[PDB]
Design a protein around this ligand. Structure first.
Ligand SMILES: OC[C@H]1O[C@@H](O[C@H]2[C@H](O)[C@@H](O)[C@H](O[C@H]3[C@H](O)[C@@H](O)[C@H](O[C@H]4[C@H](O)[C@@H](O)[C@H](O[C@H]5[C@H](O)[C@@H](O)[C@H](O)O[C@@H]5CO)O[C@@H]4CO)O[C@@H]3CO)O[C@@H]2CO)[C@H](O)[C@@H](O)[C@@H]1O
Ligand SMILES: [Ca+2]
Length: 146
């Protein structure tokens, strides 16, 4: 079966379309492509990233996945995250996190199950917290209902 990818412009083949650019250090470039013509490059030297809002169903399991690599050895990580608050008194911030520190193309995925009620709109974050000179490439991001 072909399962719908909920991520808009998931392979950056439409450049930066549908991705919020938080630090102005994102570019869609050939060298960052694992698939197709383009991938996302997040420039090194400081923490930077981007993301998009993706409304999710309650009490539902999702696959979150991505291909990523640093072009040189990072100090920290690049993280692919689905994050949202719970509707509780503590405003609990839930994060489903894939950590990447690899210097070769690497695919990782996780599965998570959403709560009964959301406290905020789920956000898919591509967060390169690493502050080394290493550039980060990411491509073919997936968010898929099971
Ligand atoms: O800049 C203008 C622009 O801002 C937008 O808001 C952005 C903001 O710019 C970003 O800086 C911010 O980045 C945050 C990431 O979204 C979020 O995913 C990340 O969360 C961290 C978390 O802080 C950390 O504790 C966690 O550590 C885990 C480890 O990774 C695991 O290995 C370990 O096992 O467990 C720990 C604990 O769980 O990692 C996660 C993932 O890295 O924190 C970033 C901030 O430091 O995102 C904002 C959006 O949410 C704004 O939206 C725009 O409108 C505006 O133009
Ligand atoms: Ca691509």
């Amino acid at each position: 079966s072909h399962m719908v990818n909920m991520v808009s412009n998931p392979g950056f083949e439409d450049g930066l379309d549908s991705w919020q650019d938080w630090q102005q250090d994102m570019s869609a470039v050939p060298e960052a492509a694992h698939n197709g013509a383009l991938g996302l490059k997040i420039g090194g030297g400081k923490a930077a990233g981007g993301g998009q809002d993706i409304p999710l169903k309650p009490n539902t399991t999702y696959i979150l996945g991505a291909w990523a690599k640093f072009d040189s050895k990072p100090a920290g990580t690049f993280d692919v995250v689905v994050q949202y608050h719970l509707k509780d008194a503590n405003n609990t911030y839930v994060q489903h996190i894939l950590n990447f520190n690899e210097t070769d193309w690497t695919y990782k995925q996780l599965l998570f199950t959403t709560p009964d009620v959301f406290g905020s709109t789920p956000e898919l974050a591509l967060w390169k917290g690493d502050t080394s000179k290493a550039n980060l490439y990411v491509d073919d991001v997936y968010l898929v209902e099971v």
